Subunit: 457 residues, 4 copies
């Protein structure tokens, strides 16, 4: 069919629900392959849903149009129009082209829901009805905040809490397994496997609190600032009304931003939220790395842990288990670190009344949230829940090390203890063998005095 | 149908061409939505094509299988199997799961081409035939290098050369337009609009040479290193043969890497290539920014340039032209900067015989190439070719500035010249008006002595 | 003099207060020129001061030694031993060499304070007295947290609050100055200069709250974890005692870390704090940029603001004022963004019981704090306090723009309003001139209907 | 004494050689503690030396002044005026304040060398003589290029070549030591220790070539572009003359930049050079990491290598050797990655005729060069030259692994080989023990058939 905009008319495939402007600009920006995320499209649709409800309640929009717009927005949110959003991330820096994409798709679909047709005859107008009371300039920042906040609360925090619960159950189960510490990669003072795991659990607790610290600023919505922040041409109740309705729809305490200029001229809440995300990435990197190192072998590595084997091995290559989950996590943590830089450059580069690096900022923040959430969940399900200690190997490393010699200090003094360690080292023997050789400690004394289970605090 | 691997059997949709391992691991890594790029899948298929040809020539693979494998690989390369590669970037760090995806799809399709069926009855074996003489460990590094090099030569360099040609044609056309320089954002010494544009052209020339400097290392292929770099179990002629065949297929001087350990244990060629890409990003950022600033207005900005209007305006809002191409470019340049960090962290994090951050490294490098290439092309087509000078505005800024006062220095000395500038500034007048007021310069003298066209070198 | 360690003896200049190990390792790490910051050295000295007091109170350290150690630590904190800390940042990753530097300097100086001598005869032992109850492994993380927290509270937050107060006083003063908005760099809807400034103020408020959100984790101290986190060989009251004493000394609510493993195996609090710092950097970049752009000229820029001239101009080059403070700030904001990446790579790279990227992490975090604090203060003092509006220029841009045409919409309808704007644009005239020409609006009507002061909400 | 500038007079300590402007602006920029590097100050002095010589040769500068300026510049270059350059990096973005610092110090010192005095009576004028024919705008870019190029050629490349030679001598010495490979951290196919080391050597060769690829653009000098690139007010022979003289002084092929606008409006050569530097950082990270991992223990790590012990150990803690050199290198590699981001943001942020992020860009590039050069040298001297293989441990890991089972494939087939590996794994025995138990291979057959020395290509 032919759709129309202020430049004229243009053919749009009958099967598609977008209009003139989307079609026109689907030719101006063949840049790469990244498109707006479903999360972001859904957040935009939620704003359109909320605006229709509020505009109905205020008496400025007819009920039939309002209801059809709400129903169309709900279909988008339910995932039923996956193919109607074809535009690139690399577009207008305000996200205008994508705002128009929502307006046109919702107008065409709402028109069908009213018994009408797609295209120039439609009863619902993209700008005058779907976009009523809004500007591209205040809609897109609003959608960024909503998309990021909901992804954090509904996807990331629960995944982190699940992994935390698992590692804490493992910590409890491993509380009595004494192992050799490693500092600088070198044999060190003992601790329990449970204590080491309790570190990971605490890192997750800290990360969860840091991420939560990003929410209050994200909850502040630009909607109602209109073109430049002043609220010119907005209905006086729209800002508060839309924010309350978004709150009702999401279950989260969204509020109208106390300073519209700040949340339009800048995307600082996304910069800060991403700072929290890269803190989680640093923790997950460490956790994932420790686990793959501790499970390395089966015979020329550390060998302290066994992990589940996800993908089929060789039969000739037992018990070679590649730590695929740790590799996926460590890779995505690198991606989060890169994404932070892209967000930072964009966030820093606002000019005057509007930051126009927005589609890129949103693309990165939402990707980072998905990566960390799915990564934590997958690592939980396919690795962490099945971690097992190799108890004999752990205990052999512990007792064949040189590190337990400090237990002898009270009983024979530092110098003789040091003398035994040096001799075991030089000769390739156990501490016990060297201690017996020097005549400094009987077999029975060694066993009574050298108790790893008493050396862990 | 039921397909089988060493863990057992698993259902695969009849409509799909992949096998047991792809299907199995399409459930282990539901991480986010990023999949391997077509560029990378094509480079992998090219290796399989080359291996089949070489293995035929060496006499180790039957002609019928070889021909069917080549034909299947060609179909993948022609874009006919877009839906047969469903795996995430966030997978095995070696890219093994994706190597298996190629082997299985090509085996199933080659089997059809031989008159056979998909699945367990197939005549072509994914590992024993499609993967003959190869390891996942040496295939994936090879494909990274090929994908990056071809994308650079076939996509990025031509786009950069096109933009360079356009800006140089503009430089020539604007060679006699004298304008006010700006340093620190402040009014400064004059230059021509052509000279300013010649800067952009030179930045593109420099960038093209820097990017070309990344090619020789990318041309070095790991193929033939097998599991750990030694070439154990490779046919002795395979490494050289495959590299020559990849050379023939691509038209580029690919060679067998002189040190297999280096191109397997590290992805340093990709790290370096991405260093070149972020240099281009810094240049494009500057170019894109200057152009949008110089075109800012229509009345409260700089106003020196007009740019084409891509997307329909308002009718009420002439001549407001949002610089959409500059916004797309500046955003993607931010993305390239982030991508560099992700590449760097991954590149730095190899252990012993294999770097296993590879799918992430490849994802970023290939994205950056696409962004810069399509970005440069779009900026060319939709902005640069239609840049026009606002000649009256440029000349008004020039002659109403305070900067031309230095022309008077030889004729009345520094102090009187400085005296005129200070008076024009204080009084809000032209230099000429102040010069006449002080009685230091006649009207006729001003016009004879103050010649911007002689102040540009 | 000759000082001694377990490798033997080594000459130390008589004029210096350090000992064998510092001297020895002042030759092993001639890497570049960066040394530990005074902030970090002071935080280390504070720990030694606190340990001495606590160890005295517990009865394990003699009063004379305790008092001399406290007095020596105080001298370091007062800045009296600036030349006694010669080691590089690029040292042991645990900061051990620097811990030893504190122990040796304090031992030698305390020995002098007791009537003794520097060197091998000293009454105070670096390890057995100054380092009593401590490990390098738990001291350095403790000092990182203290140094970062105090620098945030005592240096950065007050500087940010001072700049915020100034910009808010400016906002109030400029509340009635109506100006042209700019979105995408293009002329847009009006707002007041005060409203625009209120955006900056709100960004600072947000940043201050985000930075404060980093403090609780920084307040958690590793001290008492000893070698690997377990607290082996620590006096049972030392951890709580030292944290309380650091609290008393600083006025801040430092506490013993609930999980020692987490704050030793990782530096995640510093990663998060730096995430807050780079959020402030993104805001300051925007603020500093807007101000220099708005002050650009004097005649070929935007020209809306005048800023103080710090450094002497030319006399021939009035009124060229280079925005030096904005340049310093924008440059240091770039540095903060880089520093974040270095912190992130280090933070992510802990192994097992100890993260050994610590001197580098600390160097970056503390540099970023200093840069942002001194930058905000300097920008306040030398730029922000003296910002003045160029009222005639602002009002001329406003009224000579095309943007005020929307005021006519209610009185003559959109189409005629749009018609006037298009004609002014095409002809190079004011809106009023075009409106009179078309006979759509009288002079008196224009003035009554087009009221910028009513178009700002 | 009192010195004077266009704002008036100001006290300068009699002991210091700088003048009014340096003193004045030593109060405007108390930002943090970073000052211009000696490398950069020396490069600036070299330009002043070259300008004096050229200006003498052209007849525009008196011989006595020229000679005194040259002599003063030489003293600065010889390191004799370390305390005369007190300004911060965080200054004018053009580096003007630092250009003035050189002009004033050289003028005052040259005046002394002519029999005159420091201060207002001086015979040599900072601007009119020391800065003759130059602008701050073209001097600073010139000095950045010189400083970076010389640091690369004279400091970094030789250090990299020294480390490369050492690791290649080690590779040769270890060519017959067969060891277990590791991929994904897991036991893998064998290779020689020499082959593994040859990887590191090849990474260094590649890095050296990549760094060399940055030199031609760095050799292009802005000097002669004057204020905005046009060369207005430059002597027509100055650009070529100064570049030739800098070439003569340094031994390097410096040339006048073919496009002055490009090397003034942008610092793209520094962006690219830093891209090369971060490639070297990725390689050094890997090398340094592998070595510390391979030397980890003495008993609960990998244990394949011994490294020199730099700093004194414990006596009680043999043979615990912390890998301090690897820690210093890995930390500084993180710093280089961060520095790249700061350089990139600055490089991307030029406006119109001048990039004014220059002191920050230079600070980072020159720091990265020093870190990598001193890091490589220190790692060479204090680690690499003394690396020794633990031959018994290497051979025990090899022969007690499961990996050698593939040697049996030709002699008993895959299935029986796989059967032996599975049994050794399950039972905790050697492959030989399991092979004998199953009756599949005699003792004599095992030794004849399983030859690690034939499994390395
Ligand atoms: Na003793
Ligand atoms: Na004069
Ligand atoms: Na109308
Ligand atoms: Na068999």
């Amino acid at each position: 069919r032919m759709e129309r905009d202020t430049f004229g008319e243009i053919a749009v495939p009958a099967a598609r629900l977008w209009g003139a402007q989307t079609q026109r600009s689907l030719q101006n920006f063949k840049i790469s392959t990244e498109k707006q995320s479903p999360e972001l499209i859904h957040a935009l649709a939620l704003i359109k849903r909320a605006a229709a409800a509020v505009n109905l309640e205020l008496g400025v929009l007819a009920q039939d149009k309002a209801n059809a717009i709400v129903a169309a927005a709900d279909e988008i949110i339910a995932g039923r129009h996956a193919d109607e959003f074809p535009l690139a991330v690399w577009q207008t820096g305000s996200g205008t082209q994508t705002n128009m994409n929502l307006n046109e798709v919702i107008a065409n679909r709402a028109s069908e829901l009213l018994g009408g047709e797609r295209g120039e005859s439609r009863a619902v107008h993209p700008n005058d009805d779907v976009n009523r009371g809004q500007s591209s300039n205040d809609v897109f920042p609003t959608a960024m905040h909503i998309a990021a906040a909901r992804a954090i609360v509904d996807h990331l925090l629960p995944a982190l809490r699940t992994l935390r619960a698992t590692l804490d159950a493992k910590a409890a189960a491993f509380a009595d397994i004494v192992k050799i510490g490693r500092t600088h990669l070198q044999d060190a003072t003992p601790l329990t496997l449970g204590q080491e795991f309790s570190g990971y659990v605490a890192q997750l607790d800290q990360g969860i609190r840091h991420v939560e610290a990003a929410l209050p600023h994200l909850y502040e919505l630009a909607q109602g600032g209109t073109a430049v922040g002043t609220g010119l041409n907005a209905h006086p109740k729209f800002a508060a009304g839309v924010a309350a309705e978004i709150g009702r729809l999401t279950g989260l305490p969204f509020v109208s931003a106390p300073n519209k200029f700040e949340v339009m001229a800048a995307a600082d809440a996304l910069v800060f939220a991403h700072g929290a995300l890269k803190t989680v990435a640093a923790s997950l990197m460490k956790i994932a790395n420790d686990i793959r190192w501790l499970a390395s072998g089966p015979r020329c590595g550390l060998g302290e842990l066994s992990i589940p084997e996800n993908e089929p091995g060789s039969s000739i290559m037992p018990g070679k288990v590649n730590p695929t989950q740790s590799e996926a996590v460590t890779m995505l943590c690198c991606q989060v670190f890169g994404n932070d830089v892209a967000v930072n450059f964009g966030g820093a580069s606002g000019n005057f009344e509007l930051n126009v690096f927005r589609p890129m900022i949103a693309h990165n923040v939402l990707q980072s949230v998905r990566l960390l959430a799915d990564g934590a969940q997958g690592f939980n399900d396919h690795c962490a829940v099945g971690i097992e200690p190799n108890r004999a190997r752990i205990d052999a490393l512990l007792n064949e090390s040189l590190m337990l010699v400090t237990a002898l200090n009270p009983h024979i003094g530092y110098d003789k203890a040091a003398q035994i360690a040096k001799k075991a080292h030089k000769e390739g023997t156990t501490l016990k063998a060297a201690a017996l050789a020097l005549g400094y400690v009987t077999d029975a004394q060694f066993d009574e005095w050298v108790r790893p289970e008493h050396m862990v605090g």
